[PDB]
Design a protein around this ligand. Structure first.
Ligand SMILES: CS(=O)(=O)Nc1ccc(F)cc1C(=O)O
Length: 90
């Protein structure tokens, strides 16, 4: 059942992850609701809608509000450098 992958995106060629996130959390969780064309995530191809977002760049997402998750993602994406996401596959 459990299928967890860690992927690193070098954000050299992209300005945004190109994801929407829904829900919050050992009940519930933060999920990829949608993936947008021209984003780093779509280009990489490994992360899909329905994947649960666990960790971004050693910041844990498992017990975090959706509001705070959006803030953190905006903060991370706006600064230069590779982004490492750990997700649980659907
Ligand atoms: C568009 S952003 O720079 O604010 N980054 C994001 C923030 C929240 C989110 F769910 C996704 C992104 C993104 O880079 O796609």
């Amino acid at each position: 059942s459990l299928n967890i992958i860690t992927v690193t995106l070098n954000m050299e060629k992209y300005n945004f992850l190109g994801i929407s996130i829904v829900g919050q959390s050992g009940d519930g969780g933060i999920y990829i609701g949608s993936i947008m064309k021209g984003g780093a995530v779509a280009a990489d191809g490994r992360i899909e809608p329905g994947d649960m977002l666990l960790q971004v760049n050693e910041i844990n997402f498992e017990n975090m509000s959706n509001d705070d998750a959006v803030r953190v993602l905006r903060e991370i994406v706006h600064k230069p450098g590779p982004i490492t996401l750990t997700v649980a596959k659907s």
